[PDB]
């Protein structure tokens, strides 16, 4: 068994000549040579069986990625694990090797209007498929968008993904959230559990603003600082948008704030394409009921060069699935990864 940075990485005999890439969500990532397909691949090592929540995120992600099949969503090529549940301690996930992610790219590269337009198109095309399967990603951000050498973009990390549940979205003021703060919709800090499609559209709008200036638009440092960042640009919500917030604590918090006027998008982004700013405005709409949907965003004049609904596929059926013990979860992980074992 090959060793990498002091730890075991046994993916052989199919995968050889390992190179350390870094650390993933819950393990080590290496590039390797796939001796069957004769290409270099990405291999993530995961060890989640001692913790129930790590078991839940692993199972969730494996189930979703194995059912999804889309050019703008990372696929699983192979899964390596022991032949028995008793011998299984680690799981190796094999994926296409990508050149970079949008986070790394935005830290050192200025993006042309053509690249921003193409990247946005691919994000929304991938998001249309996810949403068609009644799934919410819930953690869209530049580090969850992978890019190959020809700028093909793939959405990754479905660890926090859920089946859409708009009837059970309501919650109290200051309800704790798990997703990355800078890309959280304003309703999450007010009265939403993030169970509706509109929360992903907000994250995509944040990503678009970031592609325009190479800086997060709302880099809140904490829960309510995040809201102050949003309202400092969008301005105070209207009476109509407040009336949609029934929870007294959330509504009265917004009422207690001094009036803030809107900062025009063309002043924040003077070099941006005017059509890109019109779409940005519609994605970064405070009211989630008025926020643009994924299919309307795809049909926006900014993406006219790419828009083709016949070439923007949807899922063949909606997706359907944590209060389950880790022993049952290890067993479910073992069963989900069975198709990749030799005798299949
Ligand atoms: F910096 C990292 C480290 C790990 C990942 C990662 N976590 N889980 C899967 C991958 C992954 C998948 C496909 N290709 C890559 N390769 C490159 C992406 C970042 C730049 C060099 C490696 C990583 C991404 C960025």
UniProtKB/Swiss-Prot annotation:
Q: Where in the cell is it found?
A: Cytoplasm, Cytoskeleton, Spindle; Nucleus; Cytoplasm, Cytoskeleton, Microtubule organizing center, Centrosome; Cytoplasm
Which part of the chain is the Protein kinase domain? 15-303
Q: Which processes are annotated in GO (biological process)?
A: apoptotic process; B cell receptor signaling pathway; Bergmann glial cell differentiation; cardiac neural crest cell development involved in heart development; caveolin-mediated endocytosis; cell surface receptor signaling pathway; cellular response to amino acid starvation; cellular response to tumor necrosis factor
> What GO terms are given for molecular function?
ATP binding; DNA binding; identical protein binding; MAP kinase activity; phosphatase binding; phosphotyrosine residue binding; protein serine kinase activity; protein serine/threonine kinase activity
Reported regulation of activity: Phosphorylated by MAP2K1/MEK1 and MAP2K2/MEK2 on Thr-175 and Tyr-177 in response to external stimuli like insulin or NGF. Both phosphorylations are required for activity. This phosphorylation causes dramatic conformational changes, which enable full activation and interaction of MAPK1/ERK2 with its substrates. Phosphorylation on Ser-19 by SGK1 results in its activation by enhancing its interaction with MAP2K1/MEK1 and MAP2K2/MEK2. Dephosphorylated and inactivated by DUSP1, DUSP3, DUSP6 and DUSP9. Inactivated by pyrimidylpyrrole inhibitors.
- At the top level, the lineage of the source is Eukaryota
Q: Can you quote the domain comment?
A: The TXY motif contains the threonine and tyrosine residues whose phosphorylation activates the MAP kinases.
Its protein name is Mitogen-activated protein kinase 1
Organism the protein comes from: Homo sapiens
Taxonomy of the source species = Eukaryota, Metazoa, Chordata, Craniata, Vertebrata
